[PDB]
Amino acid sequence: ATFEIVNRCSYTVWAAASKGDAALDAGGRQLNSGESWTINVEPGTNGGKIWARTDCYFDDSGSGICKTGDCGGLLRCKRFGRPPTTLAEFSLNQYGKDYIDISNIKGFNVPMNFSPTTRGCRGVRCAADIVGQCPAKLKAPGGGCNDACTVFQTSEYCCTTGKCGPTEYSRFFKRLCPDAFSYVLDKPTTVTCPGSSNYRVTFCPTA
């Protein structure tokens, strides 16, 4: 499948693409304001993510740090990123269908539109000023709005027993972005698309 990754933000981001235990395509790349990156993700990829990273520094090796979404210090991500990260999530060619969502389960750093570029389904968006509106106890000094699990490490926010409900902190995310996962048992906002559809991830879709 092809994913086009567009930075419409006024600031540079370093895009990242991983399935947890490896890189998708080149794994990451700098995207300047307006600049785009074309990746190929293997059919059948299950549990893939794409995200933006902010305020990064990388040496000539491709080693360094990011204030949000840092993936073990590497330009070319092999692993998931450090919260806070807004997440484009997907599983492709799962019994004939592709499944996509946006999630705030791991917090929010950048607004995002995750749209199929082929027919048969609809896109999702999380485009609110979540960082501007972020409750004080979830503000990430590095930048961004951490979710509550990251911050408090409770069974309730982390859904460690598989039994949790919504919380004041999850409802904040949900009110700013009803089309994105706010906590693990949230009513699913997943999008069933055709198998082998194609996609565009846009950072800062409105601005």
From Swiss-Prot:
CDD domains: TLP-P (cd09217). PROSITE patterns: THAUMATIN_1, THAUMATIN_2. Keywords: Cytoplasmic vesicle, Disulfide bond, Signal, Taste-modifying protein. It is found in: Cytoplasmic vesicle. GO terms for cellular component: cytoplasmic vesicle. Taste-modifying protein; intensely sweet-tasting. It is 100000 times sweeter than sucrose on a molar basis. Belongs to the thaumatin family. This is Thaumatin I. It comes from Thaumatococcus daniellii (Katemfe).
